[PDB]
Amino acid sequence: PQSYFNAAAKRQKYAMKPGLSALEKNAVIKAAYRQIFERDITKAYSQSISYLESQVRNGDISMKEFVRRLAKSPLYRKQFFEPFINSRALELAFRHILGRGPSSREEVQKYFSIVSSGGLPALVDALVDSQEYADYFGEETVPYLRGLEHHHHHH
């Protein structure tokens, strides 16, 4: 059949460990763009990217910070916050930073207040800076998504 994943087995989590070599860091940072934005960014974005990429490669900032920066990008707002309902962009924010999705109905509604007040910047800030989520997924590890294929096209 047509899918062409076949044996694309992703247990390989991209952990920015303070003690990685240069090439290893390039992989983890590239994959940070690929996990958060699904890879679809202009390279002429730069400047902010260039700084923060040098910092996470310098071990100045960790991947918890770097992922906040990427999931605070104007592109990541414009593609989800506006064309799609906030509740969907909200689920997507949990589905990225937690690398899985939301679970409790209360949780979804609580952070819905946060996305209604300060938008996706304040939402993603609340998700990464929280001690519980910084403990669960970790601060070195890039949010690798569980995915769970949800694409029932046609209605």
Curated annotation (Swiss-Prot):
It comes from the Bacteria. Contains one covalently linked bilin chromophore. This protein autochromophorylates. It is found in: Cellular thylakoid membrane. Residues 1-148 form the PBS-linker domain. Heterodimer of ApcF (a variant beta-allophycocyanin). Phycobilisomes of this organism are composed of a two cylinder core, from which six rods radiate. The core is mainly composed of allophycocyanin alpha and beta chains and of minor components. This protein is postulated to act both as terminal energy acceptor (by its phycobilin-like domains) and as a linker polypeptide (by its repeats and arms) that stabilizes the phycobilisome core architecture. Has intrinsic bilin lyase activity. Belongs to the phycobilisome linker protein family. This is Phycobiliprotein ApcE. The lineage of its organism: Bacteria, Bacillati, Cyanobacteriota, Cyanophyceae, Synechococcales.
